[PDB]
Amino acid sequence: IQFLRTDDEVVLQCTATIHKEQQKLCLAAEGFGNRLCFLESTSNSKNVPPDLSICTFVLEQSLSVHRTLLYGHAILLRHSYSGMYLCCLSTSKLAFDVGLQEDTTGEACWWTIHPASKQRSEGEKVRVGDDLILVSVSSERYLHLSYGNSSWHVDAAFQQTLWSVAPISSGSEAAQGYLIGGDVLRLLHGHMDECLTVPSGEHGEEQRRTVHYEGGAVSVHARSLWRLETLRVAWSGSHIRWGQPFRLRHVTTGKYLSLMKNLLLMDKEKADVKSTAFAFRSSKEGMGTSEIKYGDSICYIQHVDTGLWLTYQAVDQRKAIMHHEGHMDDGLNLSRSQHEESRTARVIRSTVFLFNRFIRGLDALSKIDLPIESVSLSLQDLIGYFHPPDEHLEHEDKQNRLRALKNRQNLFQEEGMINLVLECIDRLHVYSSAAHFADVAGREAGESWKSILNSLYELLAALIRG
Ligand SMILES: [Cl-]
């Protein structure tokens, strides 16, 4: 019998009917270059890793119209992946869109939580696994599941939907300094000043699939970051314990470490459990108990189905391999990502995915998925992400912004983002004018041609300034 408290992380699931069968869908959002919520499916986890990291929300506040949630309370839900708040938007006949926004002033980001049956009443504690009803303070509409364009989406409507709150992590009970599921980290041979990583971004996607240990500067770059993802939905943000199975997702490429018997990163669609499940071991011989400490624990990675140890091949850069014995100095030292670099790494991966789409759509025009709107909003968010701190800020706020900015520029540059922006610009410069682009790509494309180009130049300037 457990209760929800503020600083708890949850996923919000509703039941939908797909292929004539009941399935649980998680509320999700991305937030980078798109604000609208969508639904993420949790099925076939034995063959395809669910993507919990976009579904995960933190119960930031809970107030009467760490504190225990009560029925009738208004709550503020921070999306973990982006840092923005779930809200009832003022766009969409009588439904509003639901999505993320930065600003929590006003009522739009607040939701009152209500019993699904007479089994609960106003002012009682909300239990883990009670079905909730959520109502928008600003619009009086329910957070709602709707069926539209042969597809399920989330809106705010005057029809109810029941949401289950699955507990993920309970921030009030995370031991600080310990490995928790969903964490973004680096895996180091401390004595060697080396970390687990993949080839740099001057290599093509295929080459980027191979895994090795590398010393020097890469230990502060995006491509050494991995997210540890447990096999569970409920309590997927618990303390990680020795021998507990997980997957390791490479943040920069979005791919999953897998055993073929070579090591190779795989698309989520090929990332089955026998081939991708690993565990930490302390030797080679609810939240639950905290057991693996950042910095201090020496960790050995084992492939679960084979029992083989993740190790290195001595140079006769050390390739990463699996072997039944490995090396006496295999032991991995774990280091937790800062929130800044982790977010920048993710932002880079969405940008590269979206801009590659845009480039392919441009190439297909000259020989369609051409996401003009998302590219427009991506670029405005990226320009905001590189905004110089306003001269009116306090000293410490300014210094802090400037340090973050240098880190953001460095991570972007090292992933090749300057060349990517330059390729977008070259593809757009093939057109003589906005009207010429419109003739080929449509009126809406033509009316964003100049604005997209100006934002790409502005972004480029931000990527190299002092
Ligand atoms: Cl990720």
UniProtKB/Swiss-Prot annotation:
Compartment(s) where it occurs, according to its Swiss-Prot or TrEMBL record: Sarcoplasmic reticulum membrane
Tissue distribution of the protein: Highly expressed in heart, lung, cerebellum and brain. Detected at lower levels in adrenal gland, stomach, thymus, esophagus and ovary.
Residues in MIR domain copies: 66-116, 123-168, 176-231, 237-285, 289-337
Observed phenotype of the null mutant: Embryonically lethal. Embryos die at about 10 dpc, due to defects in heart tube development. Cardiac myotubes display enlarged rough endoplasmic reticulum and cytoplasmic vesicles that contain high levels of Ca(2+).
PTM per Swiss-Prot/TrEMBL: Channel activity is modulated by phosphorylation. Phosphorylation is increased in failing heart, leading to calcium leaks and increased cytoplasmic Ca(2+) levels.
Cleavable signal peptide: none
Record text about domains: The calcium release channel activity resides in the C-terminal region while the remaining part of the protein resides in the cytoplasm.
SUBUNIT field: Homotetramer. Can also form heterotetramers with RYR1 and RYR3. Interacts with CALM and S100A1; these interactions regulate channel activity. Identified in a complex composed of RYR2, FKBP1B, PKA catalytic subunit, PRKAR2A, AKAP6, and the protein phosphatases PP2A and PP1. Interacts directly with FKBP1B, PKA, PP1 and PP2A. Interacts with FKBP1A and FKBP1B; these interactions may stabilize the channel in its closed state and prevent Ca(2+) leaks. Interacts with SELENON. Identified in a complex, composed of FSD2, CMYA5 and RYR2.
Primary role: Cytosolic calcium-activated calcium channel that mediates the release of Ca(2+) from the sarcoplasmic reticulum into the cytosol and thereby plays a key role in triggering cardiac muscle contraction. Aberrant channel activation can lead to cardiac arrhythmia. In cardiac myocytes, calcium release is triggered by increased Ca(2+) cytosolic levels due to activation of the L-type calcium channel CACNA1C. The calcium channel activity is modulated by formation of heterotetramers with RYR3. Required for cellular calcium ion homeostasis. Required for embryonic heart development.
Family, as annotated: Belongs to the ryanodine receptor (TC 1.A.3.1) family. RYR2 subfamily.
The protein, known as: Ryanodine receptor 2
